[PDB]
Design a protein around this nucleic acid. Structure first.
Lengths: 70, 152, 134, 91, 102, 103
RNA sequence: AAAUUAGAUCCGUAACUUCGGGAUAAGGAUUGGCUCUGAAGAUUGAGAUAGUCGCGAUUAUCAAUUAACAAUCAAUUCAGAACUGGCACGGACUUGGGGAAUCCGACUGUCUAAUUAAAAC
RNA sequence: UAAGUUCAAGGCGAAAGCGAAAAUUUUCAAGUAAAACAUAAUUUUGAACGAAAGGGAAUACGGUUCCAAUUCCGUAACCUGUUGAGUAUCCGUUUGUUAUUAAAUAUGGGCCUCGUGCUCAUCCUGGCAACAGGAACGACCAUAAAGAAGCCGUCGAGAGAUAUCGGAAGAGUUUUCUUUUCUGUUUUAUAGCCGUACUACCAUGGAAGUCUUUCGCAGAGAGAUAUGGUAGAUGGGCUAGAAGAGCAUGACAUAUACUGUUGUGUCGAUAUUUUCUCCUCGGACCUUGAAAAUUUAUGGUGGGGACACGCAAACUUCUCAA
């Protein structure tokens, strides 16, 4: 997967897209990944702090689909 | 390959078209990359200019001589071989040259030759020593064989 | 006697301006410790003018006859000097070493155009504004 | 040390071909594989690519030479002879 | 899925361990030539590297200078030195023979 | 070890099945096919490689940027910087001999 | 036909010779197991001397090291010795008999697929 | 495209057809955001076939079947073509602001009530350089390069494999011994990063008391050593893919009752002259080791665009989308 946004706002910029159909949220033991699914590519935002990770689980577009993987 | 004399790639400009002509020559010995070649009637006598056989002095050693005029280089063009301007006959315009056979032929005097011996001489003094090295000689030439004798 | 003096038209020999012609504005003969080698600040031409014939009228005329310069401090080993000296370029008064700031590389390189074309007509330094197929 | 008393470069053909043709080819087998001093920049770097063509590793000049020797003696007697006809016929 | 057959490396590990102590390395146990068992070209190449990285260690520490370095570099190819200890011996006395004379 | 098989129907060893052994996330030991070696352009007379240009391959260069194929100066991806000034001074001292031979 | 020799280490090696050779000439010695011993490397070397503040943490350096500088670490090969058994030890296997000449062809090469591989080509 | 082949009317032959290879052939072939007292510049070897091993755009993993998988499924990419969108030109004046400025790759000039008056100006920048960055005049000519290459060797690098030693999790032997013996202990393509093997280069500077250097020689007043830079991200490590994914080893739980789950997946260091690649540097040769489509860079004359008081742009060599 050829992309990864190391910045917060340029990940959320890739949420309000005509594509960007889904955010497949994974919660790892040390961080949460926010893997947003545009046409090609998919785009991971690794956030480590475990608490604004839920502040960026909100402030997403509403109709954007969100998975939460098990 | 096959030809034991080196060749030289010379780049002239075209006088009527707008490109660069790329001529293969047969190398005068001493020709080197980056040097100038002058071809024409008013060529100075130096290796390897090519100029008509009337603008030469007598005894001048030449190679790549035209048999008939304009026919682009037909005589003394193997490795180590040359022709010699014997003597003009000033009008009737027929130079006599001496050819690598020993034979002495009369050319015209408007045809061209390049000054100098040809490079790559003299190949033929090394023994081949080796049937497999004559194999290699001839596999870039033709099927003159291991020539089995007819008496066999 | 000393060459690479002030008004001498040099030839750039290295780096994004190779082949261009250049006057010299100010010479540092013995190496200011930032660039301690022998160098000089030049003022040359990036984009040459183009020829005008009599048939092209007025704004095809002014379009072929612009000049784009440059301003570059260069080594003495990356220059080739000529016999030719620019003469009526006489107002290099305020261009010493203030081309570190970016906006005054543009209030000056524009101000080398107000003189590199005032000497284009009238035609002086005719070898300077020729392309010279290097 | 010295490894061969007499053959030199033709011990590689060793006991092959007869002593005269080994002796004969050795003269040519030394001058080819020699490094001649380059007559364009001065270094001992004028080696032979193919038969008749010699080139220099620095300065990048290829010349047209002899089969084994860089310049033959039959061709330097032509470069002399041509310029003493050039001295007469020019001026 | 029927477990794999045990293939034990116990026996070979025991004889590699004996043959650090030199247990089966004699003239009845040698089948390659001494060049095939240990290549002289590899042997002389590691020696020539041991010596050359010693001499760059001494020259660039500050110890010897260029003129002794090159004289020993050329002597190192040769057989004046077989180890790095005899080269360290030789350096240790041509600095004794030198600063005495200097 | 896990021995390998070829995944293309070219079973011979030419210059266009260049392959490398890979381990995959299933612990697999599979073959990956290598394409051909990218090279840089040469100087117009040195026959020495140029610098400032990425090593490219003749189909890849449409899908490369401009500045990935150029240096930035005159004769950029064509000649060395040294062969360039060998021409700038030669194109000047010859065209200045042709004024002192005219006057 | 078969047997003999055969690995490796060491010593030694004639007639002739196109000085390359012949030559692995010939001729001999050594060889297992077990306990040690020697030699052949790499990488950081290793830093000695107030005490502010409370030896502790913020806390020094030109060089001389040196003649095994000291530990770590790394592979493997080669020489030596002592003891030790049915001399069985290159313990299987892998693996040359040698020499004195005569004739022919110089050599490596090629040939009669299915009777001739040669001195024939 | 090769070696070559089939045909094309010069021809020839009673013809078949040359077990021709035609190279035949008045303009036999091209060219035009297409012209003027010929529209006007140019080229003839026609043509096609001939490589499932040469050249040549783009993909990998995990899963799945009674039978197919680089093809299905899931997942993550990529190429080609055609459209669309975003995005190299958001000024000094004067709005927020008395000038100082702020919106702002962003002016200068001269005077003028200052100027809003007048006038000038944007086909990009940086570095001494080697060269660099997200883009920053493919419309033809010209030149150069890539494609593009043999055989024997080779220092170095990485990969794969094998082997050592530790840790976690199982297994095998146990009369006796054996901190034992074994097994597995994984990370694709694609891509963002940082670095390196070695090589070339650049700046400084000027070398004999010659020095740098290789296993080897090789190199230097045609510029060595030295110190600092550039390039080749050769070939590797971090991150993304990677959903304690997936996978594999393994502890339970749940009957076919149409399934959930806890843990592991960690260190170090060998030598692979014997594998594959990458880089270097050589040698033998009266033997010098393919061609074309395809592709790019540059250069050239014209011609195209662009104007500040701001509206823009961009077959746009940039980013994305359909």
């Amino acid at each position: 997967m050829p992309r990864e946004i190391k910045e917060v706002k340029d990940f959320l910029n890739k949420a309000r897209r005509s594509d960007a159909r889904a955010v497949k949220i994974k919660k790892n033991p040390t961080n949460t990944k926010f893997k947003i699914r545009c046409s090609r590519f998919l785009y991971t935002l690794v956030v480590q702090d475990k608490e604004k990770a839920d502040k960026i689980k909100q402030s997403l577009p509403p109709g954007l689909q969100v998975k939460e993987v098990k | 390959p096959g030809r034991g004399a080196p060749l030289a790639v010379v780049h002239f400009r075209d006088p009527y078209r707008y490109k660069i002509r790329k001529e293969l020559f047969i190398a005068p010995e001493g020709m080197h990359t980056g040097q100038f070649v002058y071809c024409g009637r008013k060529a100075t006598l130096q290796i390897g200019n090519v100029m008509p056989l009337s603008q030469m002095p007598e005894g001048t050693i030449i190679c790549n001589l035209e048999e008939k005029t304009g026919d682009r280089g037909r005589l003394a063009r193997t490795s180590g071989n040359y022709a010699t301007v014997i003597a003009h006959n000033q009008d009737t315009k027929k130079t006599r040259v001496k050819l690598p056979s020993g034979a002495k032929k009369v050319v015209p005097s408007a045809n061209r030759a390049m000054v100098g011996i040809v490079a790559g001489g003299g190949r033929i003094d090394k023994p081949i020593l080796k049937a497999g090295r004559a194999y290699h000689k001839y596999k870039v030439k033709r099927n003159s064989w291991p020539k089995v004798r007819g008496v066999a | 006697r000393k060459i690479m003096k002030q008004g001498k038209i040099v030839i750039v020999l290295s780096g994004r301006y190779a082949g261009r012609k250049a006057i010299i504005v100010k010479t540092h003969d013995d190496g200011t410790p930032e660039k301690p080698f022998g160098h000089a600040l030049v003022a040359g031409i990036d984009r040459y003018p183009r020829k005008v014939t009599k048939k092209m009228g007025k704004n095809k005329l002014k379009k072929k006859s612009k000049v784009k310069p440059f301003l570059k401090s260069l080594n003495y080993n990356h220059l080739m000097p000529t016999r030719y000296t620019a003469h009526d370029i006489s107002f290099e008064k305020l261009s010493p070493k203030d081309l570190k700031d970016p906006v005054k590389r543009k209030t000056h390189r524009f101000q080398t155009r107000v003189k590199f074309e005032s000497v284009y007509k009238e035609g002086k330094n005719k070898w300077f504004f020729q392309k010279l197929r290097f | 040390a010295k490894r061969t008393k007499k053959v030199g470069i033709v011990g590689k053909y060793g006991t092959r071909y007869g002593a005269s043709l080994r002796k004969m080819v050795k003269k040519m087998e030394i001058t080819q594989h020699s490094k001649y001093t380059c007559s364009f920049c001065g270094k001992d770097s004028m080696k032979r690519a193919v038969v008749g063509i010699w080139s220099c590793k620095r300065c990048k000049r290829t010349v047209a030479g002899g089969a084994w020797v860089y310049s033959t003696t039959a061709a330097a007697s032509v470069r002399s002879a041509v310029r003493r006809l050039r001295e007469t016929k020019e001026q | 899925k029927k477990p794999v057959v045990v293939h034990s490396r116990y026996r070979v590990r025991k004889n590699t361990e004996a043959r650090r102590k030199g247990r089966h390395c004699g003239f009845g146990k040698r089948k390659g030539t001494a060049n095939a068992r240990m290549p002289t070209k590899l042997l002389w190449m590691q020696r020539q590297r041991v010596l050359r990285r010693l001499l760059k260690k001494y020259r660039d520490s500050k110890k010897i200078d260029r003129h002794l370095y090159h004289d020993l570099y050329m002597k190192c190819k040769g057989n004046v030195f077989k180890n790095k200890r005899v080269l360290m011996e030789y350096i240790h006395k041509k600095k004794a023979e030198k600063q005495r004379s200097k | 070890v896990q021995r390998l098989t070829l995944r293309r129907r070219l079973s011979y060893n030419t210059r266009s099945n260049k392959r490398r052994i890979v381990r995959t996330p299933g612990g697999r030991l599979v073959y990956q096919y290598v394409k051909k070696n990218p090279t840089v352009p040469r100087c117009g007379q040195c026959k020495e490689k140029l610098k400032g240009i990425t090593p490219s391959r003749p189909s890849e260069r449409p899908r490369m940027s401009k500045r990935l194929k150029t240096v930035s100066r005159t004769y950029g991806g064509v000649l060395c910087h040294s062969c360039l000034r060998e021409r700038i001074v030669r194109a000047f001292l010859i065209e200045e001999q042709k004024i002192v031979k005219a006057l």
